Coordinates of C-alpha atoms and ligand atoms in Angstrom, one line a residue:
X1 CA 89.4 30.1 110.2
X2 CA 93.0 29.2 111.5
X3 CA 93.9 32.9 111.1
X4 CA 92.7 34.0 114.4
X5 CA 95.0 31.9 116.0
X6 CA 98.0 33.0 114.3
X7 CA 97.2 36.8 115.4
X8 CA 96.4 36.5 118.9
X9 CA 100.2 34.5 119.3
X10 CA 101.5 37.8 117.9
X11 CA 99.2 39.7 119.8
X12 CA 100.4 37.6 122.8
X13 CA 104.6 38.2 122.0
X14 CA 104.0 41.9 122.1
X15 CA 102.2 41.8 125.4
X16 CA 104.8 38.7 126.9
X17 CA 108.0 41.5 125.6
X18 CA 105.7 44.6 126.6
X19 CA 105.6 43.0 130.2
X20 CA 108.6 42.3 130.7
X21 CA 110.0 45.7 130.7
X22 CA 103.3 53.1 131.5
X23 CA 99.6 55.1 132.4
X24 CA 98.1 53.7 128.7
X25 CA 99.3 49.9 129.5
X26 CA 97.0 49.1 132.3
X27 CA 93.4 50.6 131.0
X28 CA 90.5 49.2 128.7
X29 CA 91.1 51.3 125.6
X30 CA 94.3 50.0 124.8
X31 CA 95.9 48.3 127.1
X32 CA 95.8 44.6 129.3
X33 CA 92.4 44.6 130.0
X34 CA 91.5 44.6 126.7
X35 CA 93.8 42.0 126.0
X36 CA 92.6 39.7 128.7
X37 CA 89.1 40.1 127.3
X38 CA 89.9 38.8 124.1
X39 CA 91.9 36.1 125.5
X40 CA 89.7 34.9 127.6
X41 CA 86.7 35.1 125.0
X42 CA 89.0 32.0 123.6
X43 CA 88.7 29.4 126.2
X44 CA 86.7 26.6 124.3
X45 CA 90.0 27.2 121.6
X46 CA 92.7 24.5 122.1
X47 CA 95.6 26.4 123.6
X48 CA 92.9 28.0 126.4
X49 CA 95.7 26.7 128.9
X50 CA 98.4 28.7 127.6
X51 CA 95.5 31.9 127.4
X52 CA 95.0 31.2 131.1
X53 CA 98.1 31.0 131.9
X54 CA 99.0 34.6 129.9
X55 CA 95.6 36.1 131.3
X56 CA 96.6 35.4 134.9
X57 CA 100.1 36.6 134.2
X58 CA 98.9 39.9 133.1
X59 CA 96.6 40.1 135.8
X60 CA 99.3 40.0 138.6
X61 CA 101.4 42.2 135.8
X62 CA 98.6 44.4 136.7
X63 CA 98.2 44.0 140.3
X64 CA 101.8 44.5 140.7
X65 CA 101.7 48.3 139.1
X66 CA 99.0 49.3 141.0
X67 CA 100.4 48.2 144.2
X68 CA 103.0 50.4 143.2
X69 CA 101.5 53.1 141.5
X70 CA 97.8 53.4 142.2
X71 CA 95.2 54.8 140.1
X72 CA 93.7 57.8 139.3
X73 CA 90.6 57.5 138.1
X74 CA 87.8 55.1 138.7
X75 CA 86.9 55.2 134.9
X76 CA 85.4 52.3 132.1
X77 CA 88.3 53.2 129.7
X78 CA 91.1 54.3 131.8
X79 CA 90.4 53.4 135.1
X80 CA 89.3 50.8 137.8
X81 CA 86.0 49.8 136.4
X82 CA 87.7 48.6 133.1
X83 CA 90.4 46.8 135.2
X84 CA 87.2 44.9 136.9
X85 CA 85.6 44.4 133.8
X86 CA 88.0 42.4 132.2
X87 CA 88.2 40.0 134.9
X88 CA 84.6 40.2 136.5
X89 CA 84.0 36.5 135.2
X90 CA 87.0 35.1 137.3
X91 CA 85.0 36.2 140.5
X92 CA 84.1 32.8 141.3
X93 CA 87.0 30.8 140.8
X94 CA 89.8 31.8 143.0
X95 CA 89.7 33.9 146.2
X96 CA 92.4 36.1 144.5
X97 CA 90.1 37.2 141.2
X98 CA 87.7 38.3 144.4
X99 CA 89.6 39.8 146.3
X100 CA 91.4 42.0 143.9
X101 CA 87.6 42.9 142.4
X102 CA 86.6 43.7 145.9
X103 CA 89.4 46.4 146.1
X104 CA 88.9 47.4 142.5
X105 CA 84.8 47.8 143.7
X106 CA 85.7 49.8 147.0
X107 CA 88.2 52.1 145.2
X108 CA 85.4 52.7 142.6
X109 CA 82.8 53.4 145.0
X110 CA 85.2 55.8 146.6
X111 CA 85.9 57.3 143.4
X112 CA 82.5 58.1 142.5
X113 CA 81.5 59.7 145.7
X114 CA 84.5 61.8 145.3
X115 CA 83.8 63.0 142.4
X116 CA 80.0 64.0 142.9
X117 CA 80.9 65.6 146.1
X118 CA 83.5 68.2 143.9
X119 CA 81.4 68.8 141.2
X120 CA 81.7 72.2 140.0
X121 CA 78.6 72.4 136.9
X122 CA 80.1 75.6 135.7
X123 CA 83.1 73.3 134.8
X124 CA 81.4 70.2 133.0
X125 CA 82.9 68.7 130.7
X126 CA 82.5 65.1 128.7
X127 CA 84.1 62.7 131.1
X128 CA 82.4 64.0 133.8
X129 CA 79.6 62.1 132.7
X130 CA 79.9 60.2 129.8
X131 CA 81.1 56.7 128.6
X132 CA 84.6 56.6 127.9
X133 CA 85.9 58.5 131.1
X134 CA 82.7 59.6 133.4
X135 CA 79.8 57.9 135.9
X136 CA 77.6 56.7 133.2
X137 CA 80.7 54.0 132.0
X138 CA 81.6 53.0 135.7
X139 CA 77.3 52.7 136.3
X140 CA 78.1 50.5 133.0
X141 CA 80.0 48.0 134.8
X142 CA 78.4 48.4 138.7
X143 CA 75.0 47.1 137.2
X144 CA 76.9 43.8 136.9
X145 CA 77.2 43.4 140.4
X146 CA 74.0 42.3 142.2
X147 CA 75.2 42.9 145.6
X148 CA 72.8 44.9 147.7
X149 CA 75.8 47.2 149.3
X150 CA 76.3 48.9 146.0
X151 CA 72.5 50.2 145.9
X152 CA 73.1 53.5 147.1
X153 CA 76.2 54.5 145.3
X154 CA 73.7 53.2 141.8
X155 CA 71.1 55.3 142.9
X156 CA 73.5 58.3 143.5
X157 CA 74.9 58.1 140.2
X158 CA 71.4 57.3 138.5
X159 CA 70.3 60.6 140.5
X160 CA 73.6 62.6 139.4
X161 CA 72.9 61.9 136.0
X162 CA 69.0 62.4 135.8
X163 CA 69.7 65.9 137.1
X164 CA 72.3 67.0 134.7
X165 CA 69.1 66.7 132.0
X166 CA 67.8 69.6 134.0
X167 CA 67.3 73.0 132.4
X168 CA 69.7 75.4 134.1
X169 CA 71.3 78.4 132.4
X170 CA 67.9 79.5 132.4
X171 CA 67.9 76.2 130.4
X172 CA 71.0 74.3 129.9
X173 CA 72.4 71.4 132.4
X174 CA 74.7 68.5 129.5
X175 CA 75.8 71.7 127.6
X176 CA 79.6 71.6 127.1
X177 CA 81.0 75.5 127.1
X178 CA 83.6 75.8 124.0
X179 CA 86.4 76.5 126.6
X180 CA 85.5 72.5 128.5
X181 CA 85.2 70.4 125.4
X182 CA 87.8 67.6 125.4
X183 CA 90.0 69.1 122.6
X184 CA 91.1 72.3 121.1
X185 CA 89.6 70.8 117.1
X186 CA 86.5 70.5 119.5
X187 CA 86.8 73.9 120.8
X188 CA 87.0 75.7 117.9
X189 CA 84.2 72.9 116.1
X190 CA 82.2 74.6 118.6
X191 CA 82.9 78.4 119.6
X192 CA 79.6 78.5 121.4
X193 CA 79.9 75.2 122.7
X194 CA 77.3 72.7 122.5
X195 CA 74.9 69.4 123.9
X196 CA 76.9 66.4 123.0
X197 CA 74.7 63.8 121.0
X198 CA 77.4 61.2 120.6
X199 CA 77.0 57.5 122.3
X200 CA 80.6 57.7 123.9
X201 CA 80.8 61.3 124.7
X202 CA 76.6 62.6 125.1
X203 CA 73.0 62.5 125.8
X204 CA 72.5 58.9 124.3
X205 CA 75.0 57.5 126.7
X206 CA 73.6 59.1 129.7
X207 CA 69.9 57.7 128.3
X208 CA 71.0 54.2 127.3
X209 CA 72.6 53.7 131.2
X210 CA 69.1 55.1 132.8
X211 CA 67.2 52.8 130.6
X212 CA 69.0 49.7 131.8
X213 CA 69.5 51.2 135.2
X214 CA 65.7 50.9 134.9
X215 CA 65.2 47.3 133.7
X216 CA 68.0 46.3 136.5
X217 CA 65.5 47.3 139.2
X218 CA 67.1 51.2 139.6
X219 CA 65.2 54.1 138.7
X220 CA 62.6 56.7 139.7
X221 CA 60.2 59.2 138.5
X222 CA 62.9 61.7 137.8
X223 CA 65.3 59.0 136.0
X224 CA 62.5 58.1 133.8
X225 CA 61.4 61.5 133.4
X226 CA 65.5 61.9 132.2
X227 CA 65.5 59.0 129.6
X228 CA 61.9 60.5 128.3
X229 CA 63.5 63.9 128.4
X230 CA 66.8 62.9 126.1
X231 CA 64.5 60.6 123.7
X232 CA 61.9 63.9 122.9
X233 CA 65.3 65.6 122.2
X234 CA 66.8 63.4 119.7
X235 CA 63.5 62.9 118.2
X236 CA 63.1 66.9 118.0
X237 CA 66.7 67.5 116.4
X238 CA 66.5 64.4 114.3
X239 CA 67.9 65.9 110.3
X240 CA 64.7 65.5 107.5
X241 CA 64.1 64.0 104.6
X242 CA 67.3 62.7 102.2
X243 CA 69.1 63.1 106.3
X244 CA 66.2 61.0 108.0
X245 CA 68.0 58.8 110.5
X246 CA 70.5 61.3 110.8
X247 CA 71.8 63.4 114.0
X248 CA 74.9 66.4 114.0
X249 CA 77.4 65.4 116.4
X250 CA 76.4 68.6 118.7
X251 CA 73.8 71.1 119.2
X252 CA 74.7 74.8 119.6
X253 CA 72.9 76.9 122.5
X254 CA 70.7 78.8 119.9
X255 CA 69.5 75.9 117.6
X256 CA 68.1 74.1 121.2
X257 CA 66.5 77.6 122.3
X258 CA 64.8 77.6 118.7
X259 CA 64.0 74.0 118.6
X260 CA 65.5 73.8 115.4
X261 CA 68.7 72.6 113.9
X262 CA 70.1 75.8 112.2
X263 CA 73.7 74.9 110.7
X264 CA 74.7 72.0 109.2
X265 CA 77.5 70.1 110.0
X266 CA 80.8 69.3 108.2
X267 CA 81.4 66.0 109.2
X268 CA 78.9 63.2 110.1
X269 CA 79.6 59.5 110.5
X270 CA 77.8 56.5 111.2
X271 CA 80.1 55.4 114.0
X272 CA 79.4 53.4 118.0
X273 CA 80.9 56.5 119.7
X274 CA 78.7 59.2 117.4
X275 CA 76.0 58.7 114.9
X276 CA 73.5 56.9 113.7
X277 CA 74.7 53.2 115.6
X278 CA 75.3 54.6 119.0
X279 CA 71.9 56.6 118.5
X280 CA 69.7 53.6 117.5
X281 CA 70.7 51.8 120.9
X282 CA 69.3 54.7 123.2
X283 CA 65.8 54.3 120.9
X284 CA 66.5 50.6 121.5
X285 CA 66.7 50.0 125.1
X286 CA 64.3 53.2 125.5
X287 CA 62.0 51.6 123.6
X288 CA 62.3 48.3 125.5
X289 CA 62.6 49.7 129.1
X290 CA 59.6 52.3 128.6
X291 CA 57.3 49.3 126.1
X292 CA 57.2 52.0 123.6
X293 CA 56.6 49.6 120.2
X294 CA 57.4 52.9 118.2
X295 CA 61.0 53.5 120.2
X296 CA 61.9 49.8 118.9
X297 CA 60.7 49.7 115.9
X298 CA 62.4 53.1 115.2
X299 CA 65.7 51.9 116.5
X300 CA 65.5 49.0 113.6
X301 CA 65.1 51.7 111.0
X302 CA 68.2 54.1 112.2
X303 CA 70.2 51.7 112.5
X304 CA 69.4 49.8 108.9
X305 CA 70.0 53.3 107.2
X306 CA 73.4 53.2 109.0
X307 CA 73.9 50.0 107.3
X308 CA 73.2 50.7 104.0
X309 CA 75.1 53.7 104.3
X310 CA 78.5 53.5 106.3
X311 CA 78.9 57.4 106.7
X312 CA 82.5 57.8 106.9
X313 CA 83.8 54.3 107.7
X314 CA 87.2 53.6 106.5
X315 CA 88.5 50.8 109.2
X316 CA 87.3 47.6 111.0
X317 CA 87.7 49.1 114.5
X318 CA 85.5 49.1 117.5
X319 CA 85.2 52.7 118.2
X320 CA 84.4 54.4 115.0
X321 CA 84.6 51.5 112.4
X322 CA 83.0 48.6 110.5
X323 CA 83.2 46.2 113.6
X324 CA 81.8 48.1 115.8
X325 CA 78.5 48.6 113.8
X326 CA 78.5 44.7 113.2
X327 CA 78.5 43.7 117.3
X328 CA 75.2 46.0 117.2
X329 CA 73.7 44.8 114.7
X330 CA 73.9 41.2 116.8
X331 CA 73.2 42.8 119.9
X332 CA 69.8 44.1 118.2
X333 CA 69.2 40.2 116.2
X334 CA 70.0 38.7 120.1
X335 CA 67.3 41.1 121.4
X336 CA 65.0 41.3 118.8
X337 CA 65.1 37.9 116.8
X338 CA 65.2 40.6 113.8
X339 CA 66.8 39.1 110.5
X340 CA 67.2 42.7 109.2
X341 CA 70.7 42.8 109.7
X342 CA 71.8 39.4 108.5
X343 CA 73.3 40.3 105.1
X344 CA 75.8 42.6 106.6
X345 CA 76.8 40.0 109.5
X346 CA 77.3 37.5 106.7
X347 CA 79.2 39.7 104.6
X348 CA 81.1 40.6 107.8
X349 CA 82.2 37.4 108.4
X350 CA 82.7 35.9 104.8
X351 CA 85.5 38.6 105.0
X352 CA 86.9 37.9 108.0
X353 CA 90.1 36.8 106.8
X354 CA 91.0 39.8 104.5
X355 CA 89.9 42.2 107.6
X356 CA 92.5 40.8 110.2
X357 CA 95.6 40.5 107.4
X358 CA 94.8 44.0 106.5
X359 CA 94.1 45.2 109.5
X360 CA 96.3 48.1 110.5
X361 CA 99.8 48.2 112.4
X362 CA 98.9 52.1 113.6
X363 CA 95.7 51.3 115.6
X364 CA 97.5 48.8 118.1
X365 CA 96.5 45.7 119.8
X366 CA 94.1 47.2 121.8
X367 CA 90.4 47.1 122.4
X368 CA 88.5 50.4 121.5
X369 CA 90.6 50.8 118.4
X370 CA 92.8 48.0 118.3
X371 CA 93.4 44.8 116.4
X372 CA 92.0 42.5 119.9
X373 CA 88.2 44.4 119.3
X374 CA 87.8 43.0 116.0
X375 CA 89.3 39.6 116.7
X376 CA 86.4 39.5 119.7
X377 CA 84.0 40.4 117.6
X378 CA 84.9 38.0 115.3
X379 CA 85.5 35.6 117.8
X380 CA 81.3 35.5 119.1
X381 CA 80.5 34.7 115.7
X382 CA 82.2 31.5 115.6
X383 CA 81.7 30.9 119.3
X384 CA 78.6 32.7 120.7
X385 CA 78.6 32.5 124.2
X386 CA 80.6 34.8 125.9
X387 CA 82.9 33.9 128.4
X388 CA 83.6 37.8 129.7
X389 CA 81.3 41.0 130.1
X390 CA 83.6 42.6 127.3
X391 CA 80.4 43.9 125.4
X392 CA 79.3 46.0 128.8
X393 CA 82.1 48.4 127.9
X394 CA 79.9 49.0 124.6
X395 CA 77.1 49.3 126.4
X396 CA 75.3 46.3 124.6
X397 CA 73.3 44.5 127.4
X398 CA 72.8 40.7 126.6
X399 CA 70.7 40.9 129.4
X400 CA 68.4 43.9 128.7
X401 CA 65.7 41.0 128.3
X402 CA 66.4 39.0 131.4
X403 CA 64.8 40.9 134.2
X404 CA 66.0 42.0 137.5
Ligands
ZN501 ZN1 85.2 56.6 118.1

């Protein structure tokens, strides 16, 4: 497929013109990060050299505005621990990569401890916590690094997290008031407010990091007793029947005090960030980190009715699309050795050409929703080993398997 090559030179002359002559430009979800990921995911392709070369001029690009600027927020998406992500796997190689990720590292622990320290629970809200924005994203990308030093800030987030499955308004803690959800469509979805039970944004996110906090060497009783806590709760608000495998995007104070779902929801997809995918990786690496043979073997079956049913996919993005619930579907065959799934990859891949012609102008070059998330995707199929920890960001752990 010469097709590839032809897009990321495009993808390239936007970024070379972009750079050349703002906040968005310098984080994960859409900006150079991303775009170094996907570049450097190409370095057995011929023009590697000129990739290099482009990578490492972004990355003093990048340097150069924060020198300038700073940051604000230590965050996976939009902050520091994205910016380290994307160049993690140039540690080694010159003192510079280093040292920059050193600063990047200090600036996150810093962060973090911040943050903690002015918590206000009456206030909490999605990216305190979550993925895209909050501590269970950074945790994401610290597990990576195997220095010792960075043990106590883990464990402080691992024990952050844990607590916020507490009960607390008599019982409460991950509930998001109607007045602190991330939008006003949100606010008024949810008058009441509600528990979160997306990947990106809830309760699976904060379960799938605790779980591989746990097979990294990090947990305790109460961190466990957290990723047990969030597993009984998806299996107890799990739909029925014709809407097995199925989960709404929130639960409302009442319908968790009765046990019960009560209203249906509106809108339901099968999506990374909510839905059925995300959810199937929490009752993966659950499953896996607590050897429960039924938590696995469940995860298989979610995730297969996702498959077969593509609730509300019209794209080939990362975040909510088609390519997205491809990279787990092989993050589950790497784990696994599970053949459930090849059909789709095939199918996936046979189309590869009509998906990146087609693909869409209005989503960007970016990674989360971006034309540079499907072209890495893609790109692992052709080439499996991965140059980068891009697929950390997506909270698929290659390593889940390989110990501590
Ligand atoms: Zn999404």
């Amino acid at each position: 497929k010469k097709n590839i090559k032809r897009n990321v030179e495009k993808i390239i002359a936007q970024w070379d013109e972009r750079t050349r002559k703002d906040f968005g430009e310098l984080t994960l979800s859409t900006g150079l990060p991303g775009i170094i990921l996907m570049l450097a995911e190409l370095k057995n392709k011929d023009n590697s050299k000129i990739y290099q070369k482009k990578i490492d001029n972004y990355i003093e690009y990048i340097v150069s505005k924060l020198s300038t600027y700073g940051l604000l927020t230590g965050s996976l998406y939009s902050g520091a621990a994205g910016i380290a992500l994307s160049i993690l796997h140039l540690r080694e190689d010159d003192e510079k990569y280093k040292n920059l990720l050193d600063s990047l590292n200090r600036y996150i622990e810093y962060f973090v401890r911040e943050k903690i320290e002015g918590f206000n629970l009456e206030n909490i809200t999605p990216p305190d916590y979550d993925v895209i924005e909050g501590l269970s994203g950074i945790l994401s990308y610290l597990l990576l690094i195997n220095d010792e030093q960075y043990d106590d800030l883990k464990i402080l987030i691992i024990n952050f997290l844990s607590n916020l499955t507490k009960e607390n308004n008599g019982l409460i803690s991950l509930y998001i008031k109607s007045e602190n959800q991330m939008s006003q469509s949100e606010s008024e979805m949810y008058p009441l407010g509600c528990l979160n039970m997306g990947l990106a944004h809830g309760l699976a996110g904060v379960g799938c990091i605790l779980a591989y906090a746990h097979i990294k060497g990090y947990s305790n009783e109460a961190s466990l007793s957290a990723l047990q806590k969030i597993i009984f709760i998806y299996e107890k608000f799990e739909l029925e029947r014709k809407k097995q495998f199925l989960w709404k995007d929130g639960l409302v104070a009442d319908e968790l005090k009765k046990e019960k779902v009560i209203r249906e929801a509106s809108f339901i997809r099968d999506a990374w960030c909510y839905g059925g995918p995300g959810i199937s990786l929490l009752y993966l690496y659950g499953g896996l980190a607590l050897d429960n043979d039924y938590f696995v073997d469940k995860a298989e079956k979610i995730l297969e009715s996702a498959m077969q049913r593509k609730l509300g996919i019209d794209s080939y993005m990362i975040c909510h699309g088609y390519s997205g619930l491809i990279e787990i579907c092989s993050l589950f065959k790497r784990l696994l050795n599970t053949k459930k799934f090849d059909s789709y990859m095939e199918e996936f891949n046979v189309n590869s050409e009509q998906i990146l012609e087609e693909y869409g102008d209005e989503s960007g070059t970016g990674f989360l929703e971006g034309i540079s998330g499907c072209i890495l995707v893609l790109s692992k199929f052709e080439y499996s080993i991965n140059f980068t920890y891009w697929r950390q960001a997506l909270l698929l752990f290659d390593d889940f398997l390989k110990g501590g």
